[PDB]
Amino acid sequence: AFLVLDRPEERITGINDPRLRNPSDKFIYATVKQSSVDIYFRRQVELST
């Protein structure tokens, strides 16, 4: 039971989880400046936070 259920700290899903959808100081996520990712999040109005 210990060896089977010894789950890791899991991972992060796409851009939907609260761990990433709303920021926290400890968490740091970023992309490359002046790229398509930059003008994908900037263009969207829901992904302004």
Binding site: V45, E46, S48, T49
Partner: protein, 37 residues
């Protein structure tokens, strides 16, 4: 019509935050709320 509305500060329900200093206006989809001191 125009009417006054009161709001407290709760965690997921109403989150208050300071205005953006780089422009003087806060983000979109975030209505202003005056605070008295």
């Amino acid at each position: 019509d125009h009417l006054s509305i009161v709001t407290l500060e709760e965690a997921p329900f109403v989150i208050v935050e300071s205005v953006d200093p780089l422009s003087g206006t806060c983000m979109r989809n975030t209505v202003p709320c005056q605070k008295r001191i």
